[PDB]
Ligand binder design. Structure first.
Ligand SMILES: CCCCCCCC/C=C/CCCCCCCC(=O)SCCNC(=O)CCNC(=O)[C@H](O)C(C)(C)COP(=O)(O)OP(=O)(O)OC[C@H]1O[C@@H](n2cnc3c(N)ncnc32)[C@H](O)[C@@H]1OP(=O)(O)O
Ligand SMILES: CCCCCCCC/C=C\CCCCCCCC(=O)SCCNC(=O)CCNC(=O)[C@H](O)C(C)(C)COP(=O)(O)OP(=O)(O)OC[C@H]1O[C@@H](n2cnc3c(N)ncnc32)[C@H](O)[C@@H]1OP(=O)(O)O
Ligand SMILES: CCCCCCCC/C=C/CCCCCCCC(=O)O[C@H](COC(=O)CCCCCCCCCCCCCCC)COP(=O)(O)OCCN
Ligand SMILES: CCCCCCCC/C=C\CCCCCCCC(=O)O[C@H](COC(=O)CCCCCCCCCCCCCCC)COP(=O)(O)OCCN
Ligand SMILES: CCCCCCCC/C=C\CCCCCCCC(=O)O[C@H](COC(=O)CCCCCCCCCCCCCCC)COP(=O)(O)OCCN
Ligand SMILES: CCCCCCCC/C=C\CCCCCCCC(=O)O[C@H](COC(=O)CCCCCCCCCCCCCCC)COP(=O)(O)OCCN
Lengths: 411, 411
């Protein structure tokens, strides 16, 4: 008799094998990055490890509040973060009938956006990477206060209706309107409010240390990137894109499309994993699903929903499902989310740098002519390559243009 | 009522999430390699696409057989590949009682190894990368003829015993001793013989073309590697390792440990996937399991069994299980496989370069002091980093030493 030892199978790397267990290409990345930067990092963590006075700068800011206006705006955000809580406590019981409460919420939410978009423009002494750290706070606060309105209104209407008729600290409606949990919400790494968030058992000092080291390593890595690889390429030709021709633009962009993409990947891993896990660890949060696998995204429409899960499940719950419930024309809703995304794009990248060329708008617009294209022609492990190319020459380029035209006009 | 939207989960990159679906970090590798070399490759495929006369070189070899001794040896291998088949056909029916047949097989298998190990040493006009392409053929032929002996002997004893008492072309014992299937075995990408191999339906011109392009791209890539990154680093200090001190050796090795590892990874993907899939495609083979996931190998003992599956399932069937069945002391068998692996190492890397420093033997020996260490201390996504480090500063270094000491002594 014969019992065969050769089955009929496929190589693990092959397209039609369906293996998908490459956790270890990832550790190769980590090991190589560490072997290549684990002396420059140990030297920079010394030369900047005692020469940053992390306690004297707060006293120098206390020495003058009107200088350094960026932390001034960040602390000023509490005015809105408290006015909204005050509206909630007002209509929590008997005051401020839903009409007035809703109009007050709309006014407060509008001023959260319109106040820094005015301060950072008029006030001159503000820095671009310091203006961004006020706008990326006054949009997160706006997105959080939107849902803080919505969840409470929904639960309050539910209690109003239940007025027409537990032990495991599951906080009911009115008992969640304390300052402590509002603040815990604001710092929590999520944009969708919810009574009695999940919690994690402990703090896990090890995990927090590893995440802090990831942040301190990746910021140093991409500073190395910006200084060595991308500033020389720019100042070899300090001609700003605002006047160059659509033929020289591309010639000069191909020399930056790769380093740009690399610093964007490093931004993602530094921000959406390491920083948000440090936050969600200190304040025991436990959810920690900030991104799905956007990398193996066979089509771009699937990539748009899996990086930055917080924003996407905020959309799908407070912008999409509400405006399909009491509405229709779902394509109009997809358009609405595209327009809101374009507004926040052109508000976060164009306001701090005071440019309004509306390049990022063309970048967001040219995604649909690319989305339908990739979803129509490519499939599988070539649709994934189409998405990976779109992430190189697509949207991040439309921010590289702004930062290039700014660095050129000033150095 | 409240139905929560925040579960209690972990980030996909985190150690304790168990995601393992990173097919798309891999396509990122492919896309980046292609964007970075997809002009140099299109230029080199032209400058060498018509200036290689792929039909005149066979006529120049026919013009003189004693010059170019490497293809002479490769074609001479058929003497043994036919003597073994003749022994099989002899004792297939009535001649050559098992004693004589076994002794003839032992003699032929010994001369397969001892003949080129003598020709390439004495004959002077032979080149190192041309001597390697005769030794890596006379060991594959030896390993194949071993199992060609064993399978046939086992089936023949089975027929002898069945003498003490179908339709789907399942070839029985004696009808598999034709020249056609012996040759099909020799070129088949496997080292373990088996009557009626699996088969694939068609040839799939697309797949064959993609594999050929992978070969032509990766060889060009690693020639770029050897020329740009590693030859300058060597000829900045042309002092051969044979006399340098154990303190300067390491100082000079750290400048090559990464490029070496990169060309070894490229060797793996060029050889164990692309070339073997091209072969297994032309001759419709269908098995195509030439490697398991050796990358996510949490311990080195698991890496030793999952790269190069052909050799491992040859060991486990013709060297390991036979010598545990009629034997014992399994640790002695693990030692035996280590010793055979060391012999083929020091036979394939040391004979073509005529060096016998027995460095690769220390490299193979220092794996067990490393194997037990990694398996004892590290676990999980840090054991995988231990394995990835062992693959950088471990065995491949012990071949880089040979090739360095050879390139230095000659250029
Ligand atoms: C001008 C300049 C110069 C020009 C250029 C010139 C160039 C010239 C130079 C050019 C360079 C050339 C350089 C060449 C370099 C390469 C040469 C090499 O080094 S080739 C190395 C090949 N190495 C191997 O193939 C691996 C060795 N073999 C293996 O790994 C085997 O698979 C082996 C024998 C080790 C198998 O062992 P186990 O890994 O299975 O371990 P166990 O403990 O023995 O397993 C046996 C039993 O253990 C149990 N077991 C094992 N793991 C278990 C588990 N996880 N759970 C439960 N039971 C388990 C099972 O019951 C298993 O059973 P059951 O064998 O079926 O009877
Ligand atoms: C030297 C000076 C330097 C100084 C520095 C300078 C500083 C400045 C520089 C730089 C700073 C950086 C500034 C710029 C940064 C970048 C800015 C941005 O880009 S802003 C981010 C954009 N983020 C988004 O836009 C998220 C996008 N989110 C989404 O798109 C959504 O998730 C959305 C609405 C698309 C979700 O929808 P869907 O993808 O599911 O679409 P649908 O079809 O509506 O899904 C709904 C229903 O569809 C069905 N459906 C969909 N897919 C299905 C399937 N596969 N099978 C079956 N049914 C399916 C299901 O039934 C689903 O239902 P059900 O409502 O969820 O319960
Ligand atoms: C006009 C230029 C044409 C391309 C010339 C350069 C590339 C030549 C060959 C390179 C080696 C790779 C061959 C094609 C891919 C084979 C593997 C493959 O399918 O990769 C797939 C992923 O890779 C791709 O899809 C890559 C496709 C090409 C992407 C880029 C094409 C447009 C840009 C090319 C020129 C760029 C110039 C840039 C100048 C600044 C999936 O991988 P797998 O799991 O290994 O699949 C095995 C088969 N099921
Ligand atoms: C030789 C001249 C040097 C000039 C100075 C520059 C030196 C530094 C150059 C390049 C370093 C940055 C290149 C990689 C950028 C991507 C970083 C990255 O891995 O982003 C990842 C985020 O992106 C993704 O997950 C999706 C895409 C991943 C693609 C693979 C990224 C790693 C590539 C490594 C390249 C090889 C080493 C380079 C240095 C020798 C985070 O992964 P991780 O940290 O490896 O894994 C976490 C495990 N807990
Ligand atoms: C003899 C001189 C010794 C000098 C000191 C040792 C070298 C220090 C080097 C780097 C320290 C800073 C590393 C920053 C990035 C750390 C990332 C990290 O811890 O990743 C962890 C994973 O780590 C790894 O995969 C490997 C980490 C160890 C790599 C090997 C380091 C020691 C060996 C090389 C040291 C010498 C390098 C320079 C040689 C010229 C967490 O992984 P995950 O998959 O993202 O998540 C699971 C748990 N969340
Ligand atoms: C910007 C210049 C290119 C940098 C690209 C990033 C660094 C290299 C990228 C990825 C390396 C990932 C290593 C994972 C090792 C896993 C084991 C293994 O055998 O991996 C396979 C083999 O990996 C490799 O062949 C990659 C090894 C590193 C090659 C590095 C070459 C650097 C060349 C730089 C050229 C720059 C421009 C020069 C202009 C003169 C994965 O291969 P694949 O082609 O993705 O096959 C899939 C086909 N569907």
């Amino acid at each position: 008799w014969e019992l065969r030892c050769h089955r009929l199978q496929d190589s693990l790397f092959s397209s039609d094998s369906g293996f998908s267990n490459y956790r270890g290409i990832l550790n190769w990345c980590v090991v190589m990055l560490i072997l290549s930067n684990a002396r420059l990092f140990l030297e920079n963590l010394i030369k900047y490890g005692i020469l940053v006075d992390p306690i004297q700068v707060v006293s120098l800011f206390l020495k003058d509040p009107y200088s350094w206006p960026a932390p001034c705006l960040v602390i000023a955000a509490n005015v809105f973060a408290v006015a909204a809580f005050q509206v909630e406590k007002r209509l929590a019981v008997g005051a401020l009938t839903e009409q007035a409460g809703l109009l007050l919420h709309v006014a407060n939410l509008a001023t959260i956006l319109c106040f820094p978009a005015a301060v950072v423009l008029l006030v001159e002494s503000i820095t671009p990477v310091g203006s961004l750290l006020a706008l990326m706070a006054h949009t997160i606060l706006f997105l959080k206060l939107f849902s803080y309105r919505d969840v409470n209104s929904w639960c309050r209407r539910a209690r109003a209706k239940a007025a027409s008729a537990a032990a495991p600290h599951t906080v009911s409606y009115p008992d969640n309107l304390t300052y402590r949990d509002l603040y815990y919400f604001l710092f929590a790494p999520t944009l969708c409010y919810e009574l009695n968030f999940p919690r994690s058992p402990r703090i896990r000092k090890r995990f927090l240390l590893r995440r802090i080291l990831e942040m301190l390593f990746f910021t140093q890595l991409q500073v190395g990137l910006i200084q060595q690889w991308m500033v020389p390429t720019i100042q070899n030709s300090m001609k700003p894109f605002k006047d160059m021709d659509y033929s020289r633009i591309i010639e000069r962009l191909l020399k930056l499309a790769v380093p740009n993409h690399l610093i964007w990947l490093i931004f993602f891993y530094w921000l959406f994993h390491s920083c948000l896990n440090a936050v969600a660890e200190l304040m025991q949060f436990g959810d920690r699903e900030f991104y799905r696998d956007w990398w193996n995204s066979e089509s771009v429409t699937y990539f748009w929903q899996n990086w930055n899960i917080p924003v996407h499940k905020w959309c799908i719950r407070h912008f999409y499902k509400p405006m399909l419930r009491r509405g229709s024309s779902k394509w109009m809703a997809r358009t609405g989310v595209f327009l809101a995304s374009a507004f926040f794009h052109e508000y976060l990248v164009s306001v701090p740098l005071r440019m309004f060329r509306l390049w990022a708008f063309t970048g967001m617009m040219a995604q649909i002519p690319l989305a339908w294209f990739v979803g129509r022609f490519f499939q599988g492990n070539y649709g994934n390559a189409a998405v990976w190319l779109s992430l190189i020459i697509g949207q991040p380029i439309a921010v590289l243009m702004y930062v290039h035209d700014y660095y050129v006009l000033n150095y």
